[PDB]
C-alpha cells in the first residue's frame, strides 16, 4: 500500500554504539598530528574519522548532506543542546 519510508536522522540514532562513545574514546588514540607534514594530509586524516563515523552510522546520505542535516538539527532541536550542556557541566568538574 505504502512504500517503506526512508530512514532519517532520528534523535535515538544519534546515540548509536558506533557514535558519540566511539569518537570520544578514539579521539586521543586514532589521529596522529605533526606540523612538519603538509596540512592537507592532517586535514584529510581529521575528516577521515568523521566521514567513517557518518558512513558506518548513516550510509544512505553523503558527507555534505549529512553535516548540513546535523547542523540544522542542532540549530533546531534543543535536545542536542541539552546533551552538550550536560557534557560541558560534567567536564567542568575537573
Amino acid at each position: 500500500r505504502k512504500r517503506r519510508p526512508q530512514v532519517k536522522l532520528t534523535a535515538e540514532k544519534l546515540l548509536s554504539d558506533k557514535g558519540l562513545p566511539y569518537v570520544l574514546k578514539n579521539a586521543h588514540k586514532r589521529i596522529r598530528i605533526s606540523s612538519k607534514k603538509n596540512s592537507y594530509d592532517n586535514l584529510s586524516n581529521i575528516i577521515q574519522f568523521y566521514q567513517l563515523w557518518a558512513h558506518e552510522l548513516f550510509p544512505k546520505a553523503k558527507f555534505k548532506d549529512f553535516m548540513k542535516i546535523c547542523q540544522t538539527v542542532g540549530k533546531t532541536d534543543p535536545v542536542l543542546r541539552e546533551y552538550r550542556v550536560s557534557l560541558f557541566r560534567d567536564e567542568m568538574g575537573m
Binding site: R4, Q6, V7, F58, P59, K60
Partner: protein, 276 residues
C-alpha cells in the same frame, strides 16, 4: 492452480537409504566411498563416480537382512537429475575433514567462507548463507549397470542396453540411458557459470545467484538487509574471482550406419559434457 498427485517414491526414505549406503558400503581403507571422499578432501580427486553395480550389490546384501531398500537403482534410472542433487547433499553431510597438509595458496573460496562467516558472527551474537553448490569442489557422476546375466535384467536396467539415437524416444526424458554412436562435432571448452558472486559497492554484502538456465538476468539491486533498511539502493558488481565455473563442452553424437533402417538418414543428439 496446480493439482496434486500421489507417487510412491518417498524421497526422504530414499535419502536416508542413500546416506546409509554412503556410510555402510565396503566392496569385497574403510568404506569405498568414504575413502573416495577422504581423497576428495585432500584435493587429490574431484570425481565421485557413483557406480550402480555397487548400489545393486548393497541392495542385494541388505535384501537378505531386512530389505531396507526401495530399489534405488530402479529409482534413479527413472529420474537421475534429482538424485544427483540427493547424492551431492548426502556427500556434503558426510564430508570428512582433510587428513593431509594441503597447500592453501589459492584459497579464494575459503577466504570468502571465513570472511563472510566473521562478518555474520560479529553481529549474530547481537552485541543457508552459502549456496550448496558454491562450496562443492567435486563433480558427481553415475556409472551405469554392467551386464547382469540374471533375472534382474528382465528388460530392466535401461542403462545396460546401448541404444541408438533413433531409439531415444520422448518417453525416455529424464531417465539415465546410454547411447552408442560416433561423435562428429565436439566444441571448444567454455566456462559455464553455476553461481555468480555479485558484490555491492556499499553495504559490504555479497549476494550469490544460482543459475541453470543457459541465460540469466543480473541482480544489480542491493536487496541485502542493511542496504534495504538504509535504502542505499546500491548496485551489484560481478566478481569472477569469487564465482564458481564449470568447464562446459557440447559434443554431438551421430549414429552408426548399421543402426539406420533402410531408406532413412542418420540422426544426431547433442551431448553436454561438463566437469571432469
Amino acid at each position: 492452480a496446480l493439482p496434486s498427485i500421489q507417487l510412491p517414491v518417498d524421497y526422504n526414505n530414499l535419502f536416508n537409504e542413500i546416506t546409509d549406503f554412503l556410510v555402510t558400503f565396503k566392496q569385497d581403507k574403510g568404506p569405498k566411498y568414504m575413502a573416495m571422499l577422504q581423497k576428495v578432501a585432500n584435493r587429490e580427486l574431484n570425481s565421485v563416480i557413483i557406480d550402480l553395480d555397487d548400489i545393486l550389490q548393497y541392495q542385494n546384501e541388505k535384501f537378505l537382512q531386512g530389505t531396507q531398500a526401495d530399489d534405488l537403482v530402479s529409482a534413479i534410472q527413472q529420474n537421475a537429475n534429482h538424485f544427483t542433487e540427493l547424492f551431492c547433499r548426502a556427500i556434503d553431510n558426510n564430508m570428512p575433514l582433510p587428513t593431509k597438509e594441503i597447500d592453501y595458496k589459492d584459497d579464494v573460496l575459503d577466504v570468502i567462507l571465513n570472511q563472510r562467516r566473521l562478518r555474520n558472527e560479529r553481529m549474530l551474537s547481537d552485541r543457508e548463507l552459502f549456496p550448496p553448490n558454491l562450496t562443492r569442489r567435486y563433480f558427481l557422476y553415475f556409472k551405469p549397470l554392467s551386464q547382469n546375466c540374471a533375472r534382474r535384467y528382465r528388460k530392466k536396467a535401461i542403462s545396460s542396453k546401448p541404444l541408438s539415437v533413433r531409439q531415444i524416444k520422448g518417453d525416455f526424458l529424464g531417465q539415465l540411458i546410454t547411447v552408442r554412436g560416433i561423435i562428429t562435432r565436439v566444441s571448444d571448452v567454455k566456462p559455464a557459470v553455476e553461481v555468480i558472486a555479485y558484490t555491492c559497492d556499499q553495504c559490504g554484502y555479497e549476494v550469490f545467484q544460482e543459475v541453470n538456465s543457459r541465460t540469466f538476468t543480473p541482480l544489480s539491486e542491493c536487496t541485502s538487509e542493511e542496504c534495504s533498511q538504509n535504502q542505499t539502493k546500491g548496485q551489484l558488481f560481478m566478481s569472477t574471482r569469487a564465482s564458481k565455473f564449470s568447464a562446459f563442452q557440447e559434443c554431438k553424437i551421430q549414429e552408426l550406419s548399421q543402426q539406420v533402417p533402410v531408406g532413412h538418414i542418420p540422426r544426431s543428439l547433442n551431448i553436454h559434457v561438463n566437469g571432469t
